[PDB]
Write a protein that binds this ligand. Structure first.
Ligand SMILES: Nc1ncnc2c1ncn2[C@@H]1O[C@H](COP(=O)(O)OP(=O)(O)OP(=O)(O)O)[C@@H](O)[C@H]1O
Ligand SMILES: Nc1ncnc2c1ncn2[C@@H]1O[C@H](COP(=O)(O)OP(=O)(O)O)[C@@H](O)[C@H]1O
Lengths: 400, 55, 403, 823, 50
């Protein structure tokens, strides 16, 4: 019921300085001039019409036969000449439609019109705007790019190779005759994992992306967590072949619990279905599944096997240079200071992750804005460290 | 008896900012490179032949 | 220490760029134009069919207007219930109606059957068009599967299982001897079970080796669904589709929820399961024995319900394998190395020995890993790439055992 | 509201002070203001308190007696008007003020002062040049402050607002000059022509001052001033800068004609002539193992006819172009051409020349045998193959001029056409007086057909592209006049305006004279020709005025069918602002609305501009839109969409795009008209094995190479109406891609000019920090040996600080020298 | 008023919750007894008046 959405927005995110200057201003002037010129062009094309031809042949033949009163009802089935449609209050009409009949947009399960009186289909509402039962492609092909995260070059190269084995050079292992949807099993500290999302946006620069986080311990009798994600990556194969990011759920939803039977069914259903979808012998598709987690230990033996689920990748903590890069990225939007106090905040630091970096960068701005409002608050030099302590790392009685 | 009709379908260009700066430069270059017969004489002083529709 | 009101505006006007306000106003204008042109769309009509149908199919729409008085028999369509000896038809109608009509003169009573949907002309509700819907939901399009599964070298031939099932499936489909020499009908059933592994690959091989009456891979976990009667209808339409497609074999898979466990918690924990069981028995009871259609159920553990003792009359011949020895493993290596750019000059017998009872699935996985290692090395060559073959296979065996 | 206690106390103290200063007697006026100003200029290194005292402070400042009291009062009014500013009261009060050292009054104050100074410098009329000098002195005082406190980019903003880049040059030091020059270059793309040339000149001045001649040459090429290029080449003297200049001219393709008095002139002219281009390209292809001749058949994937075989030959030539290694047309080539039918032998021989392009020595020998062929088509194709072979690459003895001796004006139409197109491709960018004086008389011939004259015009335009060759233009106009209008405006005179646009490429302004001379022409062809030449001259400028004129003219009904020039307007829409990413993306969106609600001719033309925007750049949205519009009802629209996909994927080997084209081939297997050109698009995608890109934007994708864009625009002018012309005869016009066909890998030499194996880090290079004019930031270090294919979006960087390049721009050729700190 | 009663004999008017105002004088509306009833626009109110 959903194929694509009109992407006529996100006007050129590449505003080079992203700070108020003559270059950025001139870029915005060119942008607004382009908008003005496009509006003027379309308006002149539509107003200075190429030709006046009667009622555009609309009111003459099709509009009148469509008629004034109408009612909306779903279209159920299709026959060679007639169409079998399930209109409102459970009505069913098998009528052939010849006025404003767009078969491609008609489709089963779509809203069509009924002209009353002699009830026959006379049009379709392709908008409809109610495909809301299970919605996971709403966030598809996220705009985040490689440059958003730095200092993770090894992991970026590894994931890029693992997901550019398809798309790029598919004939490679087409001739090798394997077509491996191995996916990638991502490790990493709990202090990250949205960093795993960030390294997934690198692939998300190509095709769409689906997310299943936490889901549930599928108590549902039908199960169908992994089975519905299977239907959805079938939908992704219908679309651009999308990835499936199941960070955390690959860990809890697929937990290597030593218990065998009498255990939440997922162990019966979920792991087996995960393996069935992860084996390329059952389902085709350039879909690559990214099973991320922060608990490598709970890797189930089925998930452990590189035989079906290959391309194990470990996300380590950032190094000194990686910390420098990530802090540069996060403070670049905020013009931290003119003294560029960069290395003092990280030289003695250990076990600081991307979430903490973002949090401390945000809290530095918050504390400056609180009362120290001084643009590049001169206080920032040490207040970045002040809110870099911020306690909150960990607290558990004394026990020591 | 005369319509005095015009079909234009003409809309003015909406050039606004840098097109208009160029228009300012265009200004810089462009700077150098029936009453006597209508007051008194309404046609009411005419002569008409014997056959003439007059109330 | 809030001290915000007025001070915040003053500090916001304190710095800025020289033309930061100018840029703000310009980007506001950009967004304004954006919304204006999003309102000033292109094809500003939700309904489509603009001209390609509205120029010549619209001319045919003039013909359908001239015939607008006919083709109005749509109204509403409801299923029929039953009938009398011949003329009258007592029907339950989706308007809850106790509906009986003289079937329309153009429709003979033979075509209309109980439980089929017919449209009724509002004026007299005559049986005008008995639509044979045969509508399949998307999950049913998954239960039905491809016919030409393609033949292999007995998909990693385990001679015992295949040669035990050929007389039970291949032989009846050949129909050479079932009628006279052996008792009336061939063995009533076949249960190709076994641990996750070789199960159903032999079924696929038999499907390829047999006629076009080719199997469908239906799943019991998908059969068990919410609400009541949907699973029954799904099994019914399963049998209907299999019967229509040249009386193909029905491959029930993962029978541990369709049959459930051996118990129901309180006869209310899974009673939809029992409802499905009753109708599935009613369907695959065969009634009149018929060497035409075939059925095979495959699970990994014999967790079938009480019909497990009726099935000796119905589903006999329980067989299994999923226990590859050295010869089976090396033959699976051979059939898989038939794929890829590999050849058999590799001493794959060494790896076959290295992995005791590594299924056929894990052998296929090791071949996939060998190809992946080759492409990682960027060498598409795998025929003489044998030492690298052995290295990747052994390191991935190490990883599978302990990673 | 309850404010802070100390804050309220200080507010009351300042209230008492301002009341004292507003008292009647002035004997306490001075001490009050002495006390006040010290804490006024305190927070900047307060202003909230004096918010409601605007009028009282104005009265006090006006009432202050002239002198110290008055000028401090003006100082305080100025430093407070940054808050209480309904106008540039700060600057009026400061001009009245002390004009002593201002920079101590806080960074916010000095920045607001700089902005107001820029506003007044723009606001003051021409007749007002009295205060301009004080504002300029204030500017020259604030510029050092910005340089010290990393405000050099807004310093550049204000200096460009006041048009004082000339003293920007003198004030800027090299320690921050690189980012300032990068900022200038970024502004260049969007500033209009007068200040654009001004900033280009100032950037040349900065780089000449700081001995930054390699990038200064890039900037001079942007300026398209060959005189300044020669001047700066003379200015630089070191052997390394000389040889990198020669590389840069050779890569651009324009030959610089100089004297042998310079040192190592032989090597300089050789490397400018691209003699070693072919050798290095084959060596790197072999090192990549990418040399095997890829068969058009296994490109087609035939696991599941004369014109189709012709298309197969053409795509084979595209794949094996610049290689010269293909036995398919070498061993049994005579058999293939004999089996070929009707008009395609010429194109087959030209495709063989495409295989042998840039290979002078080998190509000439392997085409000499086919030169003496029997069929006129084969002979003309062989001559065109010779022209393709010598195209781009320059030669000392220039064999093409002598080889095309009788065929240049040969009576036979096909032989003359082949020779003329060959000479055009050869002397493209040479601007050679002898070649011009030999081909323009051929232009003057009356026996040649209309399309032959058009091809002569095309050759002349591609030879004298961007030269404003007055005699060429006069010959063009005279030939147009002599030809009668009725037979002029049929289907082929569309090459004369193309030649005019090439000859005046990138110049502008003077086009008024050309269009006034052409005004005598009748509307159906004049309205097309003037638009074409205008857009070609103003290409790469971003003239929103010109493009909105094009939009207005294509908005007309134009329904003998003069509405063809709507197509050239559509092409010009992309052509004007194709330079940077903006002006190309939005322009894409404009094309989308054109297709969304446009005339049949408009939608026929749109895919051409879509391809022009992003040739050799496989943008996903472009590919999707073109694929969705490839199945339109209009056959010409389908053809243009097919070729547009081929062009945007050209020189990319994009696997998913190739799969999409294979699916299109399956879709269009029933109709050969779409089928053979889908094959053509696949051949374009795999052209040169993807080694040579087709985008005319080189030197970090920001320089317009006139010859390449000329050839590309000729191809797009043909594809304006291939629905007639490619179906009829123009199987030769497709060979204009030689100009746009340039390799996109890195070839590293050393000071002794030997191939270095130095490895570099290659990956996506997009801006991360825009705080200033920082160099583009690369991510994804997939380092390997130096031969690396450079596509859009991604750049290269040296792995270590061990090999210093002649220029930081890393594409095409580069010399790497050992760093003094290399260890 | 009698003519109003005769109009009300045909229910008079029908309450409709307007949702989508299409450009071709078209509004989907929703009616409580049934729901959406795509219909034309009145003469006293323009397309934009919706
Ligand atoms: N004997 C065999 N020879 C070759 N491949 C085999 C063999 N047994 C299993 N396989 C491989 O195992 C995978 C799945 O096999 P199969 O279809 O028999 O099982 P399934 O339907 O996944 O279920 P289960 O493993 O529970 O039986 C395939 O990749 C198949 O190639
Ligand atoms: N190295 C990095 N560079 C840039 N951004 C990062 C980096 N690491 C994390 N981030 C950003 O910070 C956010 C939080 O990441 P992460 O630490 O994984 O969160 P969590 O710990 O909640 O999973 C991410 O969405 C990502 O955009």
């Amino acid at each position: 019921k959903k194929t694509k959405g009109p992407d006529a927005a996100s006007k050129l995110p590449l505003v080079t300085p992203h700070t108020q200057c003559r270059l950025k201003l001139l870029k915005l002037e060119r942008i607004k001039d382009y908008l003005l010129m496009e509006e003027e062009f379309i308006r002149n094309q539509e107003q200075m019409k190429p030709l006046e031809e009667k009622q555009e042949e609309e009111r003459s033949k099709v509009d009148d036969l469509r008629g004034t009163p109408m009612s909306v009802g779903t279209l159920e089935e299709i026959i060679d000449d007639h169409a079998i449609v399930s209109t409102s209050v459970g009505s069913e009409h098998y009528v052939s439609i010849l006025s404003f009949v767009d078969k491609d947009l008609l489709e089963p399960g779509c809203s069509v019109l009924l002209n009353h009186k002699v009830h026959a289909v006379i049009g379709v509402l392709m908008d409809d705007t109610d495909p809301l039962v299970t919605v996971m492609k709403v966030e598809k092909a996220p705009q985040e790019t490689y440059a958003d995260i730095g200092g993770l070059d090894n992991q970026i190269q590894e994931i890029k190779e693992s997901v550019e084995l398809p798309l790029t050079h598919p004939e490679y292992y087409e001739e090798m005759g394997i077509k491996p949807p191995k996916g990638v099993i991502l490790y990493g500290p709990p202090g990250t994992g949205k960093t795993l999302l960030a390294k997934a946006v690198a692939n998300q620069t190509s095709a769409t992306f689906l997310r299943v986080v936490g889901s549930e311990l599928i108590q549902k009798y039908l199960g169908d967590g992994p089975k519905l994600v299977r239907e959805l990556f079938r939908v992704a194969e219908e679309h651009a072949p999308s990835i499936v990011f199941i960070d955390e759920i690959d860990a809890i939803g697929t937990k290597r619990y030593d218990s065998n039977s009498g255990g939440e069914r997922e162990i019966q259903r979920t792991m087996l279905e995960l393996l069935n979808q992860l084996d390329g012998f059952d389902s085709r598709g350039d879909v690559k599944v990214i099973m991320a987690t922060n608990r490598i230990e709970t890797l189930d033996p089925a998930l452990i096997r590189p035989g079906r689920i290959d391309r194990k990748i470990e996300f380590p903590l950032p190094d000194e240079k990686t910390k420098k890069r990530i802090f540069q990225i996060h403070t670049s939007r905020m013009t931290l200071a003119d003294d560029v106090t960069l290395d003092d905040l990280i030289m003695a630091k250990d076990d600081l992750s991307g979430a903490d970096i973002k949090a401390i960068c945000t809290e530095a701005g918050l504390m400056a804005l609180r009362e120290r409002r001084m643009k590049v608050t001169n206080e920032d030099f040490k207040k970045s460290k002040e809110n870099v302590l911020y306690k909150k790392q960990e607290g558990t009685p004394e026990g020591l | 008896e005369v319509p005095k009709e015009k079909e234009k379908e003409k809309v003015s260009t909406a050039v606004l900012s840098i097109t208009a700066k160029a228009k300012k430069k265009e200004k810089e270059k462009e700077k150098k490179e029936e009453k006597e017969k209508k007051k008194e004489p309404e046609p009411n002083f005419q002569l008409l032949d014997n056959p003439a529709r007059v109330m | 220490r809030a001290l915000d009101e007025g001070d915040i505006a003053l500090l916001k006007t304190y710095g800025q760029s020289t033309y930061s306000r100018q840029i703000k106003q310009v980007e506001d204008d950009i967004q304004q134009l954006l919304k204006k042109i999003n309102e000033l769309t292109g094809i500003k009509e939700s309904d489509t069919g603009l001209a390609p149908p509205a120029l010549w199919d619209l001319a045919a729409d003039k013909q359908t207007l001239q015939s607008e008085q006919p083709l109005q028999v749509a109204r509403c369509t409801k299923i029929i219930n039953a009938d009398s000896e011949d003329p009258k038809y007592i029907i339950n109608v989706k308007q809850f109606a106790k509906f009986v009509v003289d079937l329309s003169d153009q429709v003979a009573p033979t075509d209309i059957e109980e439980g089929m949907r017919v449209g009724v002309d509002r004026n007299k509700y005559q049986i005008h068009i008995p639509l044979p819907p045969k509508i399949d939901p998307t999950v049913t399009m998954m239960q039905v599967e491809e016919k030409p599964d393609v033949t292999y070298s007995d998909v990693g031939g385990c001679k015992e299982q295949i040669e035990k099932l050929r007389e039970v499936v291949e032989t009846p489909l050949l129909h050479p001897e079932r009628f006279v020499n052996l008792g009336i009908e061939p063995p009533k059933g076949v249960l190709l079970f076994g641990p996750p592994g070789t199960g159903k690959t032999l079924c696929a091989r038999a499907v390829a080796n047999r006629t076009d009456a080719c199997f469908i891979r239906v799943i019991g976990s998908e059969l068990v669904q919410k609400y009541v009667g949907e699973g029954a209808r799904m099994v019914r339409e399963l049998f209907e589709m299999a019967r229509t497609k040249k009386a193909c074999l029905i491959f029930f898979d993962e029978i541990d929820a369709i049959g459930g466990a051996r118990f129901d918690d309180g006869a209310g924990g899974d009673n939809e399961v029992q409802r499905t069981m009753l109708e599935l028995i009613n369907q695959l009871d065969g009634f009149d024995p018929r060497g035409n259609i075939k059925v095979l159920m495959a699970t990994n553990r014999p967790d079938t319900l009480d019909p497990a003792l009726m099935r000796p009359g119905r589903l006999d011949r329980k067989i299994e394998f999923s226990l590859p020895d050295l010869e089976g493993r090396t033959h699976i290596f051979k059939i898989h190395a038939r794929s890829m750019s590999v050849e058999r000059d590799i001493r794959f017998e060494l790896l076959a020995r290295l992995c005791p009872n590594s299924t056929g699935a894990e052998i296929r996985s090791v071949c996939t890993e060998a190809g992946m290692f080759a492409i990682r090395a960027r060498r598409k060559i795998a025929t003489e790439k044998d030492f690298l073959e052995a290295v990747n296979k052994v390191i991935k065996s190490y990883a599978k055992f302990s990673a | 509201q309850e404010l802070s206690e100390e804050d309220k106390q200080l507010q009351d103290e300042l209230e008492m002070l301002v009341e004292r200063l507003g008292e009647k007697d002035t004997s306490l006026y001075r001490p009050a203001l002495e006390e006040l100003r010290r804490q006024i200029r305190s927070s900047t290194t307060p202003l909230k308190f004096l918010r409601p005292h605007y009028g009282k402070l104005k009265e006090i400042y006006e009432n202050m007696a002239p002198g110290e009291n008055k000028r401090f009062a003006a100082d305080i009014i100025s430093v407070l008007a940054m808050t209480m500013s309904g106008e540039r009261e700060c600057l009026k009060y400061r001009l009245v003020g002390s004009q002593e050292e201002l920079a101590s009054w806080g960074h916010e104050y000095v920045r607001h002062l700089a902005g107001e100074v820029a506003k007044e410098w723009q606001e003051l009329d021409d007749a007002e040049k009295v205060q301009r000098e004080p504002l300029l002195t204030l500017v020259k005082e604030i510029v050092p402050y910005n340089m010290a406190h990393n405000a050099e980019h807004e310093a550049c903003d204000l200096l460009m607002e006041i048009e004082q880049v000339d003293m920007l040059e003198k004030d800027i030091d090299e320690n921050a000059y690189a980012k300032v020059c990068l900022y200038l270059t970024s502004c260049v793309n969007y500033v209009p022509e007068p200040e654009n040339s001004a900033l280009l000149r100032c950037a040349l001045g900065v780089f000449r001052k700081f001995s930054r001649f390699p990038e200064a040459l890039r900037l001079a090429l942007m300026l398209n001033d060959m005189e300044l290029v020669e001047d700066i080449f003379t200015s630089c003297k070191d052997v390394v800068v000389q040889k990198q200049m020669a590389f840069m001219l050779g890569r651009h393709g324009v030959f610089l004609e100089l004297s042998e008095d310079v040192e190592e002139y032989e090597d300089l002219t050789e490397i400018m002539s691209n003699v070693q281009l072919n050798s290095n390209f084959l060596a790197l292809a072999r090192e990549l193992d990418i040399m095997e001749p890829k068969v058009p058949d296994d490109i087609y994937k035939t696991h599941l006819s004369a014109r189709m075989n012709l298309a197969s030959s053409f795509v084979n030539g595209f794949v094996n172009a610049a290689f010269g290694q293909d036995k398919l047309l070498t061993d049994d080539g005579n058999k293939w051409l004999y089996k070929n039918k009707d008009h395609g032998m010429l194109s087959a021989a030209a495709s063989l020349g495409m295989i042998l392009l840039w290979d002078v020595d080998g190509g000439l020998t392997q085409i000499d045998k086919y030169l003496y062929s029997s069929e006129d088509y084969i002979k003309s194709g062989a001559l065109l193959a010779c022209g393709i072979v010598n195209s781009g690459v320059r030669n000392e003895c220039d064999p093409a001029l002598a080889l095309l001796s009788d065929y240049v004006l040969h009576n036979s139409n096909t032989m003359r056409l082949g020779s003329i197109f060959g000479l055009g491709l050869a002397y493209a960018g040479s601007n050679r007086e002898d070649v011009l004086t030999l081909l323009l008389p051929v232009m003057g011939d009356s026996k040649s057909s209309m399309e032959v004259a058009g091809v002569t015009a095309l050759a002349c335009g591609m030879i004298a592209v961007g030269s404003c060759n007055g005699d060429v233009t006069s010959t063009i106009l005279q030939t147009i006049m002599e030809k009668s209008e009725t037979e002029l405006k049929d289907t082929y005179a569309r090459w004369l305006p193309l030649g005019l646009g090439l000859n005046h490429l990138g110049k502008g302004e003077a086009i008024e004279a050309i269009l006034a001379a052409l005004e005598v022409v009748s509307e159906p062809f004049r309205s097309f020709a003037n638009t074409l030449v205008d857009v070609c001259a103003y290409a790469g400028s971003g003239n929103v005025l010109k493009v909105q004129q094009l939009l207005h003219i294509c908005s007309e009904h134009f329904d003998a069918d003069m509405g063809a020039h709507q197509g050239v307007a559509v092409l010009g829409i992309a052509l004007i602002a194709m330079g940077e990413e903006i002006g190309a993306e939005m322009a894409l969106r404009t094309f989308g609305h054109l297709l969304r609600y446009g005339e049949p001719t408009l939608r026929r033309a749109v895919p051409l501009a879509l391809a022009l925007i992003s040739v050799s750049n496989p943008r996903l949205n472009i590919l999707d839109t073109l694929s969705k519009f490839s199945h339109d009802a209009d056959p010409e629209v389908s053809y243009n969409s097919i070729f547009a996909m081929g062009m945007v994927g050209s020189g990319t080997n994009n696997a998913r795009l190739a799969a999409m084209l294979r699916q299109l081939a399956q879709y269009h297997a029933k109709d050969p008209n779409n089928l053979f050109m889908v094959r053509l698009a696949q051949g374009l995608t795999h052209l040169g094995k993807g080694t040579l890109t087709l985008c005319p934007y080189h030197s970090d994708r920001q320089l317009m190479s006139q010859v390449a864009v000329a050839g590309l625009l000729t191809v797009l002018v043909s594809f304006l109406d291939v629905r007639n012309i490619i179906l009829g005869k123009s199987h030769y016009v497709l060979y204009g891609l030689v100009a746009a066909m340039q390799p996109r890998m890195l070839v590293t030499f050393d000071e002794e000019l030997r191939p270095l194996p130095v490895s570099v880090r290659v990956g996506q290079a997009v801006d991360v920090v825009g705080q200033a004019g920082k160099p583009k930031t690369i991510t994804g270090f997939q380092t390997h040996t130096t031969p690396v294919l450079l596509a859009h979006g991604e750049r290269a960087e040296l792995a270590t600080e061990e090999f210093l390049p002649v220029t930081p721009i890393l594409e095409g050729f580069v010399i790497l020298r050992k760093n003094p700190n290399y260890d | 008023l009698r003519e109003e009663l005769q109009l009300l004999q045909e229910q008079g008017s029908y309450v409709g919750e307007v949702v989508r105002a299409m450009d071709k004088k078209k509004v989907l509306v929703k009616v409580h007894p049934e729901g959406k009833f795509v219909v034309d626009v009145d003469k006293n109110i323009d397309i934009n008046d919706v």
